[PDB]
């Protein structure tokens, strides 16, 4: 739960743990406070909404045969006005009111009503027959009204053919009792599928027969459930094992695990027109598209997405609906998008709390969503223009989590009741229960033919002409269904938008939840490189090796350094010991060496990957934040933030150290080298400036202030362009290295972006003495270090000793240094304190 | 420089002039180039009645029946032999009836002699929410359809299969009625039958707009273009009772036929103008420069709304298409080149002006048509595939 | 300002043309008897047009339609025959004072003022002046500004020439015509081919707004305040003049001339 | 539909109430006794646009405005389009249209300064004079 | 659109004039060198950007140097007329004769001072560095 919700005097938790131990405080400003000790926004105090469960926030400030019972907009059917259960805020709709009122008809004698007259606690009331309304001009006679306007007039369609309304059902349904719509007998009996944890269950529409679809006691929690009817398959997701499973509705010893190595999948949607699966990952902030086998993967939405939790699809129109928190604002919202991810719109942005769970109505073209914070089920139209509430309050819907819709009913799962519930999709003042147990139900879906209507798949013929992947989309002019093309990882769309071109060089960047590779230009291909993710995780340092198709990245959550291959086929750990705070990584491709900096130990460390040999080469630094290496030149560059901040140059082995730049630097940050110009470039995050000099720091130039580089953090240089990232804009920016003002934004909305690097074999070139075939590895034993004038030095691992040739090192590498995590003036202890 | 001097092309000489026909035409007048004849089969006339389209053959003084419809056919335009199979394509508009919206329809018209022996089916472009499509024009270079709707007050462009729809002009329109296109110049011309009638010309991509005539217009109901004699524009008025011609830049205006018996449509072929009389159901022809006297060809059903001339050389097929596949959704001609456009409700992908952010759409291939030549007969197989049976003396596939 | 019109001279065609600021109408106003027109000024209160000719070596006044035409000055301006119309290339008008100002770059360079009705012929600037091609007035200060292409300066004085100051002093290579708005002065330069703006009192802020392949010839600022609103003497009955009505020297009253 | 598809207009002749107003056609439109509707502009212009002639019952003609240069008004208080004025057809039955008073040839402009006069009622530029 | 946040007619892009004020319209991103001048235009052989490659044919012979090399004027047409009271310069300019030989450049390309022989200062004068 979000920390702000904790100790807010309202139970967000299933078991109320967010409020049990809290000590409260008052609230005010542009806010309002009401019964039960709750605080509410100022505008909410008068908007026709029961934001306070006491119904108190509307006291002061409705269809035919209905009455607004309080002095405000709580609107209830005529019977409730006296039926004897307080349906309104404090009675006022009861036989007698504790406030002093009584049900009677005295006013009716005066009124001279044109039609039936009804008893009311306060005064009396008059109403009119179906198709008519009472007129505000005299409150006594009857006028002609368009019954179709009434919310819930018919289950699917309404027509006022002669003022009198008639109800119609679509081609898949049959009509009952003049307003209800039932499903044609040609289709199998409708079924309900829901999960209660370790098991996945199937039940009948009336809730009296239950069975288990897959009884294998070998899996984690079943979180999301979706189905394909024609293929008669059921699909569900497990976040404990990070897996997606599919079964056959018969459950006859057939269970398959999809070929999708996706981190923490949490919600699932199925597309039956294009045979596609849509997956939602909340910890990774990603939405992905795969086929029913998992063998083709596309990244659909990763930018300006925050913890997507609910997803719903309509493939007959090419629409995708999901609920997510804005990464740049952190506000909950419900969005509509095209199934290709190309076009996005926000349908709900007010009074949304925690909008977990979305379902769709395909005959009325409506979206239904669940909110567990404000305790409600609410529906809007695909365009968001009309909003209605099905149930609200902790009594009717205290903690709903999942929702599904069929005919006149909605089925949702509630964690407080630990039950599966049945409600009327229009309005249900007293929901009903369908399944009850002592286990929390997680996902619910309904399985029937009409829930997955048929449409002609534009991709179904010749793959829509797409060379690699075809995804459904929405026709903005006709309103129908169309298509779009997508390329696999390592590919990008050609100018014809149908063929895919292989991408050799790409731009690589790291963030809290992911390490990603994207084209150097404005492109619809969200990811070129197979993404890299973990959880809980925070990736900061990244470097690459292009000769062996490998990338190196560091994680500060686990304090580990990893090497991985851009095709995802490999993952290995370089080191997981004595790393305290790895702030920057750099790689040398001539000697196969990796360098990293630690602000915890205030040191710079070098390691050799051919045999995993490690040494610490610089110590007693202050704030070593950035490092870059130049093997052909025999130089190493490092930056320190301690005042006066400085940039320093050294020999690849650390034998020399000199401050090459030590003036007008606040936060000297990421460092890049330009091999064409033999120049060094750096970014300053305190002064938000870009400066470049030669390797001696003797010539210094500053670029013109980038129009929106409010707070840059990382820099990389490629061809005639400079690429930098902004920590506040959450963006990647492109600039021209000679002046500083050709400006472009390649990506935006990336949460916690940290560093950017450019991946290219053309960049990782050059030669040094270590490389010579006549002197393999520079004839060194354990370390070879390039130094200027094509010279080299042979280093040794930590604790070893050197001999007369000054090239071979012999001794014992068996001892690691102590656990000196504490700084000066502090006594270290066995307990890690 | 004189208006009447020649029917197609003129050349100056020190003390005289010569008239000459353009390629595909021959000269057989007593004076060279004073009149031109066109190669290929003789021209045909297309006559959309209230609920049927009829064909007339000028060479044989003969009548044939081509299409029947359940709704009021308003405008007709054709595309000549787009597939080289010997069957042209016809596009027509039908107005909304009651609650039923209007539509634009596509059909195959054989270039060879054929009639009821070859029943023709209909295809609908699927353009939704059309209300009163009073005008229709075909672009054979760009492969586009252009239409004007008087109730929505819009001019829209689409692909000949209805695959991409864009709105070109929406503002400052009052009952758009007739539209004509010139791909060589990259210009479109249309008439407005509003309270203040007008004649306007724009670029075929909508980026430039100009008004050519705004005076002495009562009801400009028909528009035609002459590409053989410059690029002149001709319009018919059934309230002023006149046929008038202008230069596509508005620098010249003339009255060609006076006391036109309520002209409602225009077509120009072989130095002659062809027009229709609103109520008489009559077809009248004269010389396109207003010379001589007028003659009556047919006394057709009073419902005749338009007369169109059907011939290989009416529209210059040879005109080269400059789009060269660069745009991904729509390519629209303009003077001296082309431009790219996205379907309505779409925009270009950020930073690009040659790519659009909208769903792609499959080309809608039209069904196989009845192709039984030489007066054969067409019958549909059990799988609905067309097949031909030929009369005495003809044999082979179809009726070749 | 009144007609929302622009007036210009064309020396290759030897014509004067007027257009609307919306660019929808273009007309030729004077089409003959122009030998070498060099400077043009327009009067928004009297509804008059003034221009200089460097072949006839004279000053002309007309009505904006180009119909009435009178010659307002000739020969010399000093009763000493040292300063005479030789190379007039500058004109600016002040109706509030009823004066016309012009600059000449003859071997004897000078800036002289005459009255819009042709009276009070006098010389305002006669020393340290060699190649004037610029004369402009600032009405918020009652100041006169001119530039010298030879001495490389921009100088401002009062409407009678008895106070002199330099915004730029010898630092400009080849300055041409000038225009003034608020605290800024704008000028054109022929050797660098630039349009530059500076501070009208000392030039402490200087920038180049545009440079061009061809030499810039004239520069003006358009805003209502560059043609201040004032009462026209000839407004009600054209002063009863049968042909031309011209504001008297000093700006009070009018004169009638054939 | 409001469009005469029968020549006698018998199709629309029995149309039911088309709008609750009791009228058969909307605003910016004109209605006829045959339940056929026509652009208001066509009222009283010498053409029975409504087959039953109801669109130009002569009493209706007095109301429509007619600017003299683009449109013409006839002695019958009926209006005709500009080109019709001398097209050679009695577009209005009173025969005011085509009257010699209107159709007769123009009055040549008087010779101005810089010109010359000819016995022919013609003016010639002074340079051309000899 | 320019980096200065200025809007200029598109034809002006890659034309040799700093129309944007910041030269944004005349830089490598535009690829002025790749441009292929129209038939109605004229070309400058030694085209190094920003020196404009294309010149309107109407401008080629006009008395003013349009190409940086002045090639358009280095063609057949003759030198424009100048008054007898004037001096003429390679810039295609006529200047008052008195200006000749005073060590200040009046013609622009120094033709007003080239080849001059200067008389020494008089006793009533003062001399400057
Ligand atoms: C009552 O009805 C009349 C028409 O009968 C209407 O003009 C008036 O506005 C109505 N008043 C109210 C308060 O609705
Ligand atoms: C029920 O389904 C069958 C088979 O699809 C169909 O033929 C029948 O018309 C349907 N009935 C209704 C009332 O829709
Ligand atoms: C799983 O994916 C890999 C890589 O895409 C592929 O090589 C392999 O064949 C797939 N296996 C199955 C069973 O689809
Ligand atoms: C979809 O199509 C299949 C195959 O034609 C048919 O079996 C099924 O009943 C259809 N379902 C719906 C909802 O139309
Ligand atoms: C700054 O660097 C220069 C050059 O290396 C050095 O001489 C100077 O002592 C340094 N000063 C500080 C305060 O680091
Ligand atoms: C038109 O008639 C001529 C005979 O006059 C004939 O040769 C020609 O084939 C006919 N064309 C069509 C399309 O029927
Ligand atoms: C048709 O167009 C081609 C190519 O533009 C041209 O050569 C030919 O003269 C044109 N013919 C006619 C008849 O317009
Ligand atoms: C000058 O430009 C401004 C702003 O673009 C515009 O308002 C004004 O009309 C223009 N004037 C002329 C004469 O082009
Ligand atoms: C141009 O401006 C003038 C002066 O305001 C005005 O009278 C004229 O109508 C304008 N022309 C157009 C076409 O806007
Ligand atoms: C001109 O002015 C001078 C000034 O001293 C005066 O002495 C002289 O008489 C005047 N006349 C001429 C023509 O020099
Ligand atoms: C002429 O100007 C002078 C100043 O130059 C002034 O003193 C005088 O009053 C003005 N008027 C006349 C009539 O001299
Ligand atoms: C305009 O200014 C730029 C920058 O000073 C210069 O390089 C260019 O040559 C100038 N253009 C002309 C035509 O003088
Ligand atoms: C009644 O007439 C008005 C025009 O006066 C029309 O707009 C309206 O649609 C008609 N009645 C309705 C509401 O149908
Ligand atoms: C212009 O383009 C053509 C190809 O269309 C190319 O061959 C030529 O080299 C280009 N440049 C010039 C100066 O012609
Ligand atoms: C004109 O130019 C041509 C081509 O450069 C040259 O051969 C000829 O001599 C020139 N004629 C004159 C008059 O300079
Ligand atoms: C309660 O909270 C407000 C801020 O909303 C202030 O802290 C104020 O001091 C408090 N007021 C009361 C009544 O305690
Ligand atoms: C630190 O490292 C040393 C040497 O390996 C010992 O393992 C010691 O137990 C460690 N101390 C702590 C607290 O982790
Ligand atoms: C026809 O018109 C009358 C008078 O207005 C009534 O409105 C009647 O209801 C109409 N008839 C129908 C069936 O709409
Ligand atoms: C010329 O026009 C005038 C009116 O402007 C008169 O109609 C006159 O009668 C005409 N001249 C002649 C000679 O008839
Ligand atoms: Ca809480
Ligand atoms: Ca509320
Ligand atoms: Ca009650
Ligand atoms: Ca809750
Ligand atoms: Ca001749
Ligand atoms: Ca002179
Ligand atoms: Ca002098
Ligand atoms: Ca009429
Ligand atoms: Ca007539
Ligand atoms: Ca430029
Ligand atoms: Ca030139
Ligand atoms: Ca000099």
**DSSP assignment of A175-221:** EETTTEEEE-TTSPPPEEEEE-SS-EEEEETTS--EEES---S----
Residue nearest to atom 12 of ligand 3 (CA): A259
Kind plus residue range of the DSSP H or E element containing A502: strand A500-502
- Please measure the distance between the N-terminal and C-terminal CA atoms of chain E and give it in whole angstroms: 47
| Residue to substitute in E44, E46, E50 for testing ligand 12 pocket (most ligand atoms within 8 angstroms of CB) | E50
**Do A33 and A22 touch, CB atoms closer than 8 A?**
no
Q: Do chains A and C touch (3 or more CB pairs under 8 A)?
A: no
* CB spacing of E29 vs A742 below 8 angstroms: yes
What are residue A264's phi and psi, to 5 degrees? 50, 55
Kind plus residue range of the DSSP H or E element containing D101: helix D100-103
* Residue E56: exposure state from Cβ atoms within 10 A (0-12, 13-18, ≥19): middle
**Do B272 and B281 touch, CB atoms closer than 8 A?**
no
C-alpha distances out from residue C171 to C151, C154, C167, C190, C210, Å: 9, 9, 10, 14, 19
Sign of the alpha-carbon torsion through A742, A743, A746, A751 = positive
* Nearest one of A451, A443, A407, A447 to A234, comparing CA atoms: A447
**Do C59 and C88 touch, CB atoms closer than 8 A?**
yes
Query: B245-272 burial, b for 16+ CB within 10 Å, e for fewer?
Result: bbebeeeeeeebbbebbbbbbbbbbbbe
E24 near A CB under 8 A? yes
> Which distant-in-sequence residues (6+ apart) come within 8 Å of A395 by Cβ?
none
C-alpha distances out from residue B215 to B220, B239, B251, Å: 11, 13, 14
Cα distance between residue E84 and residue D73, in whole Å: 72
**What is the rounded (10 degree) CA torsion for A800, A804, A807, A811?**
-20
* Residue C59: exposure state from Cβ atoms within 10 A (0-12, 13-18, ≥19): buried
Per CB-CB distance under 8 Å, the chain E contacts of A741 are 3, 22, 24
Cα distance between residue B264 and residue B283, in whole Å: 10
Ligand 6 pocket residue status of B41, Cβ below 6 Å? yes
Per CB-CB distance under 8 Å, the chain E contacts of C207 are 21
Best to test chain A binding among E1, E2, E3 (most A CBs inside 10 Å) = E3
Q: How many residues does chain A have?
A: 833
DSSP of chain C: --S-EEEEEETTTTEEEEEETTSS-EEEEE-SS-S-EEEEEEETTTTEEEEEETTTTEEEEEETTS--EEEEE-SBSSSSSSSBSSSEEEEEEETTTTEEEEEE-SSS-EEEEEETTS---EEEE-SS-S-EEEEEEETTTTEEEEEETTTTEEEEEETTS--EEEEEES--SSEEEEEEETTEEEEEETTTTEEEEEETTT--SEEEEEE-SSPP------SGGGS-----TTTTTGGG-SSEEEEPTTSSSEEEE-
**Do A607 and A795 touch, CB atoms closer than 8 A?**
no
Cα distance between residue B365 and residue B163, in whole Å: 11
Where chain C is discontinuous (C–N > 2.5 Å), the residues before each break are none
**Do A550 and A532 touch, CB atoms closer than 8 A?**
no
C-alpha distances out from residue B257 to A717, B222, B240, Å: 73, 14, 11
Cα distance between residue A240 and residue A243, in whole Å: 8
Ligand 28 ion: residues within 5 Å (CB): D 84, 87, 89, 91, 97-98
> Can you give A749-817 as a three-state secondary structure string?
CCCCEEEEEEECCCCCCCCCHHHCCCCHHHHCCCCCEEECCCEEECCCCCCEEECCCCCCEEECCCCCC
Cα distance between residue C163 and residue C145, in whole Å: 12
Q: Which two tokens stand for residue B185?
A: 């110049």
C105 near E CB under 8 A? yes
Q: How many residues does chain E have?
A: 129
C-alpha distances out from residue B41 to B63, B67, B112, B399, Å: 16, 21, 8, 18
For residue A653, the CA-to-ligand 5 centroid distance in Å is 22
Residue of B343, B351, B359 lying closest to A484 (CB–CB): B359
What are residue D86's phi and psi, to 5 degrees? -140, 30
Sign of the alpha-carbon torsion through E16, E21, E27, E32 = negative
* Residue D1: exposure state from Cβ atoms within 10 A (0-12, 13-18, ≥19): middle
Q: Which two tokens stand for residue C104?
A: 């000449």
Residue of B nearest to D49 (CA): B279
- Is B26 in a helix, a strand, or coil? strand
Q: Which two tokens stand for residue D49?
A: 């646009």
Q: Which two tokens stand for residue A368?
A: 């239904």
Cα distance between residue D130 and residue C47, in whole Å: 41
Q: Which two tokens stand for residue B35?
A: 């009149």
**Side-chain-side CA neighbours of residue A822 (13 Å):** 10
Supply the Cα-derived Rg of chain C in whole angstroms. Answer: 18
* Residue A696: exposure state from Cβ atoms within 10 A (0-12, 13-18, ≥19): exposed
**What is the rounded (10 degree) CA torsion for A448, A452, A456, A462?**
-100
Cα distance between residue C254 and residue C98, in whole Å: 9
Cα distance between residue A678 and residue A701, in whole Å: 14
- Is A302 in a helix, a strand, or coil? coil
Distance (Å) from the C-alpha of residue B302 to the closest C-alpha of chain A? 36
Q: What is the DSSP letter of B356?
A: B
Q: Which two tokens stand for residue B360?
A: 């792609």
The verdict on whether omega for the bond into residue D69 sits within 30 degrees of 0, i.e. cis, is no
Cα distance between residue C82 and residue C108, in whole Å: 7
Q: Which two tokens stand for residue A159?
A: 């027509």
Cα distance between residue A283 and residue C46, in whole Å: 78
* Residue A829: exposure state from Cβ atoms within 10 A (0-12, 13-18, ≥19): exposed
| Cα angle value B240/B246/B249 (rounded, 5°) | 135
Q: Which two tokens stand for residue A90?
A: 């404090």
Query: B160-196 burial, b for 16+ CB within 10 Å, e for fewer?
Result: bbbbbbbbbbeeebebbbbbbbbbebbbbbbbbbbee
Best to test chain B binding among A457, A462, A476, A524 (most B CBs inside 10 Å) = A476
Cα distance between residue A446 and residue C133, in whole Å: 88
**Do A533 and A514 touch, CB atoms closer than 8 A?**
yes
* Residue A9: exposure state from Cβ atoms within 10 A (0-12, 13-18, ≥19): middle
| Cα angle value A52/A57/A60 (rounded, 5°) | 155
| Cα angle value B34/B35/B41 (rounded, 5°) | 160
**Do A222 and A440 touch, CB atoms closer than 8 A?**
no
- Is B182 in a helix, a strand, or coil? strand
Ligand 3 pocket residue status of A821, Cβ below 6 Å? no
E83 near C CB under 8 A? no
**Do A525 and A518 touch, CB atoms closer than 8 A?**
yes
Ligand 9 pocket residue status of C24, Cβ below 6 Å? yes
> Can you give C178-211 as a three-state secondary structure string?
EEEECCEEEEEECCCCEEEEEECCCCCCEEEEEE
- Residue written as token pair 């036109």: B260
Q: Which two tokens stand for residue B127?
A: 């353009």
- Is A740 in a helix, a strand, or coil? coil
Q: CB count, 10 Å around CB of A37? A: 13
Cα distance between residue A365 and residue A318, in whole Å: 12
DSSP of B58-120: TTTTEEEEEEE-SS-EEEEEEE--TTSSSEEEEEEEE--BTTBPBEEEEEEEESSS--TTS--
Q: CB count, 10 Å around CB of A669? A: 24
For A254-258, which contacts have Cβ atoms below 8 Å and span 24 or more sequence positions? A255/A214, A255/A216, A258/A290, A258/A292, A258/A293, A258/A294
Cα distance between residue A13 and residue A372, in whole Å: 9
Residue of C107, C190, C211 lying closest to E98 (CB–CB): C107
Per CB-CB distance under 8 Å, the chain B contacts of D7 are 302
Residues with CB under 6 A from ligand 1: A 136-137
Q: CB count, 10 Å around CB of A20? A: 10
Cα distance between residue B30 and residue D64, in whole Å: 53
| Residue to substitute in D14, D21, D22 for testing ligand 18 pocket (most ligand atoms within 8 angstroms of CB) | D22
- Residue written as token pair 């060379």: A467
Going by their DSSP bridges, the two strands C206-211 and C194-199 should be labelled as antiparallel
How determined?
Answer: cryo-EM
> Which distant-in-sequence residues (6+ apart) come within 8 Å of A115 by Cβ?
A126, A127, A128, A129, A132, A142
Ligand 9 pocket residue status of C217, Cβ below 6 Å? no
Q: Which two tokens stand for residue E4?
A: 């200065």
The phi-psi region of residue A100 (left if phi > 0; otherwise alpha if psi is between -120 and 50; otherwise beta) is left
* CB spacing of B259 vs D87 below 8 angstroms: yes
Residue of B nearest to D89 (CA): B259
A744 near E CB under 8 A? no
What is the atom index within ligand 16 of the atom nearest the CA of A28? 5
Q: Which two tokens stand for residue B218?
A: 């009562």
| Sheet (strand C175-181) strand order | C175-181, C184-189, C194-199, C206-211
Ligand 10 pocket residue status of C80, Cβ below 6 Å? yes
Task: Give me the resolution in angstroms, 1 decimal.
Answer: 3.0
Q: Which two tokens stand for residue C101?
A: 């100002």
Per CB-CB distance under 8 Å, the chain A contacts of E30 are none
Per CB-CB distance under 8 Å, the chain C contacts of E104 are 150, 152
* CB spacing of E105 vs C212 below 8 angstroms: no
E47 near A CB under 8 A? no
Cα distance between residue C176 and residue C194, in whole Å: 10
């Amino acid at each position: 739960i979000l920390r702000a919700y904790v100790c807010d005097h309202d139970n967000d938790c299933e078991d109320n743990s967010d409020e049990h131990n809290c000590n409260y405080d008052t609230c005010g400003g542009h806010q309002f406070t009401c019964s039960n000790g709750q605080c509410i926004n100022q505008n909410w105090v008068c908007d026709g909404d029961d934001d306070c469960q006491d119904s108190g926030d509307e006291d002061g400030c409705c269809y035919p045969r209905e009455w607004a019972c309080p002095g405000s907009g709580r609107c209830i059917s005529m019977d409730k006005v006296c039926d004897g259960v307080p349906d309104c805020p404090e009675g006022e709709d009861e036989n007698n009111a504790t406030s002093g009122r009584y049900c009677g008809t005295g006013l009716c004698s005066i009124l001279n009503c044109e039609y039936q007259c009804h008893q009311t606690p306060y005064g009396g009331e008059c109403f009119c027959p179906p198709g008519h309304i009472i007129n505000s001009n005299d409150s006594r006679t009857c006028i002609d009204f368009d019954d179709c306007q009434i919310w819930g007039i018919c289950d699917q369609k309404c027509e006022s053919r002669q003022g009198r309304h008639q109800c119609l059902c679509e081609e898949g349904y049959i009509l009952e009792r003049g307003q209800h719509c039932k499903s044609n007998d040609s289709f199998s009996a409708a079924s309900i599928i829901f999960s209660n944890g370790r098991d996945l269950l199937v039940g009948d529409l009336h809730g009296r027969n239950f069975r288990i679809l897959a009884e294998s006691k070998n899996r984690g929690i079943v979180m999301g459930v979706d189905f394909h009817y024609q293929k008669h398959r059921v699909f569900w997701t497990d976040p404990m094992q990070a897996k997606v499973f599919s079964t056959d509705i018969n459950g006859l010893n057939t269970q398959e695990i999809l070929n999708v190595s996706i981190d923490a999948p949490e919600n699932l949607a199925v597309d039956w027109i294009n045979n596609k699966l849509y997956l939602v990952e909340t910890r990774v902030n990603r939405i992905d598209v795969v086929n029913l086998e998992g063998n083709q993967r596309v990244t659909l939405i990763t930018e300006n997405l925050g913890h997507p939790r609910g997803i719903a699809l309509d493939p007959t129109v090419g629409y995708l609906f999901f609920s997510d928190w804005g990464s740049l604002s952190g506000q909950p919202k419900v969005e509509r998008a095209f199934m290709d991810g190309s076009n996005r719109k926000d349908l709900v942005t007010t009074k949304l709390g925690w909008p977990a769970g979305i379902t769709l109505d395909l005959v009325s073209k409506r979206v239904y969503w669940v909110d567990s914070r404000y305790d409600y089920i609410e529906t809007v139209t695909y365009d968001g223009i009309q909003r209605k509430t099905v149930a609200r309050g902790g009594s009717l819907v205290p903690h709903p989590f999942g929702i599904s819709l069929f005919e006149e009913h909605v089925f949702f799962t509630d964690w407080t009741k630990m039950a599966v519930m049945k409600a009327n999709k229009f309005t249900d003042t007293n929901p009903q229960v369908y399944h009850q147990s002592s286990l929390t139900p997680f996902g619910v879906t309904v399985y029937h033919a009409l829930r997955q209507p048929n449409a002609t798949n534009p991709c179904g013929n010749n793959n829509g002409g797409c060379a690699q992947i075809c995804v459904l989309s929405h026709r903005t002019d006709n309103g129908g269904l169309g298509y779009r093309c997508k390329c696999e990882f390592g590919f990008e769309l050609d100018a014809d938008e149908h063929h895919c071109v292989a991408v050799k060089n790409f731009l690589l960047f790291s963030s809290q939840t992911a390490v990603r590779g994207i084209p150097f230009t404005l492109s619809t291909q969200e990811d070129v490189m197979v993404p890299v993710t973990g959880s809980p995780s925070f990736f900061v340092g990244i470097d690459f090796d292009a000769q062996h198709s490998t990338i190196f990245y560091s994680d500060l959550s686990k304090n580990i350094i990893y090497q991985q291959k851009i095709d995802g086929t490999g993952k290995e750990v370089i080191t997981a010991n004595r790393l305290q705070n790895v702030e920057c990584l750099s790689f040398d491709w001539i000697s196969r060496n990796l360098y990293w900096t630690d602000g915890g130990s205030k040191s710079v460390t070098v390691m050799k990957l051919a045999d995993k040999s490690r040494r610490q080469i610089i110590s007693n630094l202050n704030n070593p934040r950035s490092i870059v290496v130049h093997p052909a030149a025999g130089y190493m560059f490092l930056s320190d933030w301690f005042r006066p901040a400085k940039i320093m140059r050294a020999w690849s082995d650390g034998s020399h150290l000199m401050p090459i730049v030590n003036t007008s630097l606040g936060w000297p940050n990421g460092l890049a080298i330009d091999w064409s110009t033999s120049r060094l470039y750096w970014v300053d995050a305190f002064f938000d400036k870009i400066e470049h000099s030669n390797l001696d720091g003797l010539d210094r130039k500053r670029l013109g202030h980038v129009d929106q580089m409010t707070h840059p953090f990382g820099l990389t240089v490629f061809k005639d362009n400079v690429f930098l990232t902004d920590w506040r804009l959450g963006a990647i920016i492109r600039v021209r290295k000679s002046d500083g003002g050709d400006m472009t934004v390649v990506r935006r909305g990336i949460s916690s972006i940290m560093h950017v690097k450019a991946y290219d074999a053309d960049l990782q070139t050059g030669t040094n003495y270590c490389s010579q075939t006549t002197h393999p590895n520079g004839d060194c034993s354990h370390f070879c270090f390039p130094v200027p004038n094509f010279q080299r030095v042979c280093g040794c691992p930590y604790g070893m000793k050197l001999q007369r040739d000054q090239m071979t090192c012999e001794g014992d590498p068996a001892r690691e240094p102590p656990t000196q995590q504490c700084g000066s003036s502090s006594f270290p202890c066995n307990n890690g304190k | 420089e004189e208006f009447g001097i020649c029917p197609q092309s003129c050349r100056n000489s020190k003390g005289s002039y010569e008239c000459f026909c353009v390629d595909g035409f021959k000269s057989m007048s007593t004076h060279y180039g004073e009149r031109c004849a066109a190669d290929g089969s003789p021209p045909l006339l297309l006559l959309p009645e209230n609920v049927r389209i009829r064909k007339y053959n000028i060479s044989s003084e003969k009548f044939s029946e081509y299409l029947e419809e359940e709704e009021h056919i308003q405008a007709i335009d054709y595309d000549w032999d787009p597939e080289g199979i010997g069957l042209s394509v016809v596009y027509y508009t039908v107005l909304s009836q009651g609650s039923q919206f209007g539509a634009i329809k596509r059909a195959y018209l054989p270039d060879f002699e054929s009639g009821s022996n070859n029943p023709v089916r209909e295809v609908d472009l699927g353009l939704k929410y059309l209300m009163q499509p009073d005008g229709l024009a075909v672009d054979w270079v760009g492969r586009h359809i252009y239409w004007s709707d008087a109730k929505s007050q819009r001019i829209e462009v689409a692909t000949l299969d209805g695959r991409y729809r864009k709105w070109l002009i929406t503002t400052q329109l009052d009952q758009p009625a007739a539209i004509a296109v010139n791909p060589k110049l990259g210009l479109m011309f249309w008439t407005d039958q509003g309270k203040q009638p007008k004649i306007e010309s724009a670029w075929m991509n909508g980026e430039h707009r100009s008004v050519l005539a705004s005076a002495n217009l009562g009801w400009p109901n028909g528009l035609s273009i002459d590409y053989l004699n410059g690029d002149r524009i001709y319009w018919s008025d059934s309230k002023e009772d006149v046929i008038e011609s202008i230069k596509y830049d508005g620098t010249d205006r003339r009255l060609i036929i006076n006391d036109a018996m309520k002209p409602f449509s225009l077509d120009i072929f072989e130095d002659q103008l062809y027009w229709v009389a609103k109520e008489k159901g009559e077809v009248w022809r004269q010389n396109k420069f207003g010379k001589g006297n007028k003659e009556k060809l047919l006394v057709v059903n009073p419902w005749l709304t338009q007369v169109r001339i059907f011939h290989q050389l009416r529209y210059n097929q040879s005109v080269s298409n400059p789009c060269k596949q660069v745009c991904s959704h729509l390519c629209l001609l303009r003077p001296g080149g082309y431009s790219c456009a996205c379907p309505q409700g779409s925009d270009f992908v950020t930073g690009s002006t040659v790519e659009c952010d909208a769903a792609s759409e499959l080309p809608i291939t039209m069904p196989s048509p009845c192709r039984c030549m030489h007066g054969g007969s067409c019958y549909f197989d059990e799988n609905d595939l067309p097949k031909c049976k030929c009369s005495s003396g003809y044999s082979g596939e179809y009726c070749e | 300002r009144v007609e929302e019109r622009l007036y210009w001279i064309d020396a290759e065609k030897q014509i004067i043309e007027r257009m609307f600021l919306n660019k929808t109408n273009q007309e030729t106003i004077i089409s003959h008897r122009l030998r070498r027109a060099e400077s043009l000024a327009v009067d928004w209160v009297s509804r008059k047009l003034y221009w200089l000719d460097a072949i006839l070596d004279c000053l002309f006044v007309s009505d904006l339609e180009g119909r009435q035409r009178k010659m307002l000055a000739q020969h010399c301006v000093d009763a000493n025959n040292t300063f005479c119309f030789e190379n007039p290339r500058g004109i600016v008008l002040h109706p509030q004072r009823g004066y016309v100002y012009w600059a000449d770059w003859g071997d004897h360079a000078y800036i002289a003022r005459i009255g819009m009705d042709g009276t009070n012929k006098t010389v305002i600037i006669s020393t340290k002046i060699e190649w004037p091609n610029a004369i402009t007035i600032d009405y918020t200060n009652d100041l006169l500004y001119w530039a010298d292409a030879h001495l490389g300066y921009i100088e401002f004085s009062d409407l009678e020439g008895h106070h002199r100051h330099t915004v730029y002093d010898g630092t400009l290579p080849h300055p041409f015509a000038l225009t003034i708005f608020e605290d800024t002065v704008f000028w054109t330069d022929w050797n660098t081919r630039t349009v530059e703006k500076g501070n009208k009192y000392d030039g402490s802020g200087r920038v180049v707004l545009v440079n061009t392949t061809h030499k810039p010839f004239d520069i003006h600022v358009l805003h209502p305040y560059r043609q201040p609103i004032m009462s026209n003497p000839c407004a009600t009955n054209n002063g009863g003049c049968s042909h031309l009505c011209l504001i008297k020297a000093g700006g009070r009253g009018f004169t009638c001339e054939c | 539909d409001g469009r005469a598809d029968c020549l006698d207009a018998s199709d629309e002749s029995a149309c039911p109430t088309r709008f609750p107003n009791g009228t058969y056609c909307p605003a910016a439109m004109f209605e006829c006794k045959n339940h056929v509707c026509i652009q208001s502009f066509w009222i009283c212009d010498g053409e029975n646009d409504c087959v039953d002639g109801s669109d130009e019952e002569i009493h209706l003609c007095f109301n429509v405005p007619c600017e003299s240069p683009q449109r013409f008004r006839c002695d019958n208080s009926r209006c005709i389009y500009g080109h019709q004025l001398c097209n050679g057809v009695d577009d209005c039955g009173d025969g005011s249209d085509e009257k010699e008073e209107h159709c007769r040839k123009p009055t040549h402009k008087p010779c101005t300064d810089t010109e010359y006069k000819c016995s022919n009622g013609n003016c010639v530029s002074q340079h051309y004079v000899c | 659109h320019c980096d200065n946040g200025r809007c200029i007619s598109s034809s002006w892009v890659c034309d040799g004039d700093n129309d944007c004020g910041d030269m944004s319209d005349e830089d490598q991103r535009h690829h002025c060198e790749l441009q292929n001048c129209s038939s109605t235009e004229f070309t400058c052989i030694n085209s190094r950007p920003p020196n404009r490659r294309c010149i309107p044919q109407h401008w080629v012979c006009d008395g003013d140097a349009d190409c940086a090399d002045a090639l358009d004027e280095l063609q057949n047409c003759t030198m424009r007329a100048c008054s007898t009271g004037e001096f003429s310069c390679a810039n295609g300019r006529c200047i008052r004769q008195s200006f000749r030989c005073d060590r200040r450049n009046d013609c622009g390309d120094y033709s007003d001072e080239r080849g001059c022989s200067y008389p020494p200062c008089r006793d009533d004068q003062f001399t400057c560095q």
